[PDB]
């Protein structure tokens, strides 16, 4: 069936291209990052800005929201994943730790919990840190190209990363070795997300197609593409059901895809520039979307 | 709603500071540095090297990413600055290939490239002394002749090297973005003014396009 969503809110205040956006665990708070150098916490319900966090480096590529909501993370060309404390007794937001140690730019950061964050970098390796001391407890080498995205399983026992080598690797969080090899893309993989079951993930590559990989088969379960769409995917997200797949293309409009029918069923054309980030709430009642236009849009 | 009004007041306090920070950064022009090793990238003028400078009360913020797909992040910069060693003929073709990748990049189709053919002194002496012959790497140099003190032989070679890159530039630019070649040395202090004048014309070509004069 067709899907139509009507930009219930418009989040204005970013003055540069937005690059990443993560929902809070309460499905109401939202952190977004832009090349402006600001990491803004949004009240989705009222479009209020809770915090505005000045970033040391404006070349940010990823943002994260701590599942507890106490901390957010930012990373990019500065080669460092910074951690910010949102519950400071002094009332301001301040950096708690800086996770230096990556040899390339960081493309994705995701908190497993407090004192444990996993980051991916362009140096072809991912690293699992602890924020208490700031030391890489594990490293996940095995990619031959820059790693672009991360997706943590619902149980946070495994995470999946995609790299420019057109391959996606699942990793054992607690043991450190790659457990699965997925390939088939004809160009860079640019966005990765987990199907809510946790036994599958969707890849979005610059070859202008999305594809669904099941950890139990590693085969081409479904291919989401069409002849009239000839541009890559910048972000990929899943709805709470898993039947709806959303992807932010460079044609300036997100496309909603039926994950099982493999046919497009909607479009979220409301941006004047490349859609960069895209994520669905934990509640499933909202769908934020950021783009280089410098506005986020809540779609329902 | 009493607390909501104090939150809505806070958001406007945040928005006021956000706007006041944007107006400061709007007047400062971003520049990206690219080039192969052994070029004068760091001399002709954080995890990634920065360099700010201001000419004629206009501020420039110049970037050099030591640590390409991060190139996408530098979309909507004022101008890319590409530095290449014109003296090393053997690596010149490799630099020529690099300039092709940058010029026809999907996300740089509107970004003008300011090309510096650096270390022109080393090019002059290399062919002035006749120690090495350019025609080994570029057979077409035997057919080229200069259209324009300066020794005739070095000038003939000097303009041939530029012609290779400008031919690469004009083959696909179509006027959306323009390459601005230059010759400079490690001692040339005017390299900063070349970027300033070139950015004025890059801005002008943007006003002409967006005001329907073009």
């Amino acid at each position: 069936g067709r899907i139509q969503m009507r930009t219930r809110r418009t989040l204005r205040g970013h003055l540069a291209k937005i690059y990443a956006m993560h929902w809070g665990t309460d499905s109401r708070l939202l952190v977004s990052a832009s090349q402006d150098g600001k990491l803004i916490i949004w009240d989705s319900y009222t479009t209020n800005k809770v915090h505005a966090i000045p970033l040391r480096s404006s070349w940010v590529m990823t943002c994260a929201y701590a599942p507890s909501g106490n901390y957010v993370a930012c990373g990019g060309l500065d080669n460092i994943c910074s951690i910010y404390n949102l519950k400071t007794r002094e009332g301001n937001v301040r950096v708690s730790r800086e996770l230096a140690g990556h040899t390339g730019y960081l493309s994705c950061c995701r908190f497993l919990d407090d004192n444990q964050i996993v980051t991916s970098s362009g140096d072809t390796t991912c690293a699992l840190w602890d924020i208490e001391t700031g030391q890489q407890t594990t490293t996940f080498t095995g990619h031959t190209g820059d790693v672009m995205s991360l997706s943590l399983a619902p149980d946070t026992r495994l995470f999946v990363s995609g790299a420019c080598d057109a391959s996606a690797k699942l990793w054992d969080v607690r043991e450190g070795m790659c457990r699965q090899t997925f390939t088939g893309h004809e160009s860079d993989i640019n966005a990765i997300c987990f199907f809510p079951n946790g036994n599958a993930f969707a890849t979005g590559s610059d070859d202008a197609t999305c594809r669904l990989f099941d950890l139990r088969a590693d085969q081409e379960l479904m291919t989401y593409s069409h002849d009239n769409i000839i541009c890559g995917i910048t972000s990929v997200s899943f709805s709470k059901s898993g039947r709806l797949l959303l992807a932010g293309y460079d044609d300036f409009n997100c496309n909603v895809w039926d994950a099982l029918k493999a046919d497009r069923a909607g479009v979220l054309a409301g941006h004047d520039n490349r859609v960069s980030c895209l994520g669905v709430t934990d509640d499933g009642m909202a769908v934020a979307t950021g783009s280089w236009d410098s506005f986020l849009k809540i779609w329902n | 709603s009493a607390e909501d009004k104090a939150a809505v007041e806070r958001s406007k306090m945040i928005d006021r500071n956000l706007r006041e920070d944007g107006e400061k950064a709007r007047r400062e022009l971003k520049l990206l540095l690219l080039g192969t090793g052994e070029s004068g990238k760091s001399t002709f003028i954080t995890g990634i090297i920065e360099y700010p400078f201001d000419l004629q009360k206009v501020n420039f913020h110049m970037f050099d990413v030591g640590g390409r797909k991060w190139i996408q992040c530098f979309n909507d910069v004022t101008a890319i600055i590409f530095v290449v060693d014109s003296s090393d003929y053997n690596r010149l073709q490799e630099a020529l290939n690099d300039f092709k990748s940058i010029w026809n990049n999907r996300w740089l189709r509107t970004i003008s490239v300011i090309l510096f053919l650096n270390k022109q002194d080393l090019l002059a002496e290399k062919v002035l002394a006749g120690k090495s012959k350019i025609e080994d790497y570029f057979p077409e140099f035997a057919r080229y002749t200069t259209p324009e003190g300066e020794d005739p032989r070095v000038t003939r070679a000097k303009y041939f090297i530029r012609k290779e890159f400008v031919d690469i530039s004009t083959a696909s630019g179509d006027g959306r973005h323009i390459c601005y070649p230059h010759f400079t040395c490690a001692v040339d202090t005017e390299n900063a003014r070349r970027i300033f004048n070139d950015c004025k014309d890059i801005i002008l070509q943007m006003n002409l396009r967006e005001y329907n004069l073009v």
Partner: single-chain antibody
Amino acid sequence: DVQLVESLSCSASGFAFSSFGMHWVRQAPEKGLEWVAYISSGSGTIYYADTVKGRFTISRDDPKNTLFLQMTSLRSEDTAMYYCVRSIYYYGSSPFDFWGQGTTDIVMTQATSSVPVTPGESVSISCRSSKSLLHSNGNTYLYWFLQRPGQSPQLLIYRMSNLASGVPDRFSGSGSGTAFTLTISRLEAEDVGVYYCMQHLEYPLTFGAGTKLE
């Protein structure tokens, strides 16, 4: 850590004073509490109690992190202990978090004046209001404070159910609409004091009478 010292003027240290809206709350020798005034972040909005409206003035100057209160004409009604209280309003914030040491319309009442308590008990406190604090947001703008003898009040519960930071799990507020309760499981020696309830739906911020536990 966080400090608010008074002598009227209030000196702030150890927190981002500019980001907190400030209150003044006064206490006659024994008559409960009364919200003297209120100033928001950036001095955008100012409120006063009906008893001092226009007669008192509240001013705040961020750079030196100091809060002021001035009296146009003193009366015998104003002899009281004056408190400096901070408050910050955003989505999940807890207003009325920290109180100073002190310097020497909705109606809410308490059905209890004083009760004896012993350790290990599960005493509960009660309060009443003249209007439904449950807003359409789903929030209920009720607050709880504990004023131990010789000590300033300290926040226990904000919005009737949320446990304040640095307060043990023992305290647990509850209620719905107009009827409210505050449970103290495993009563301990340091829990003896006067308990005040407050509303924040509309100004002035009317306090309760005060239940003195013994």
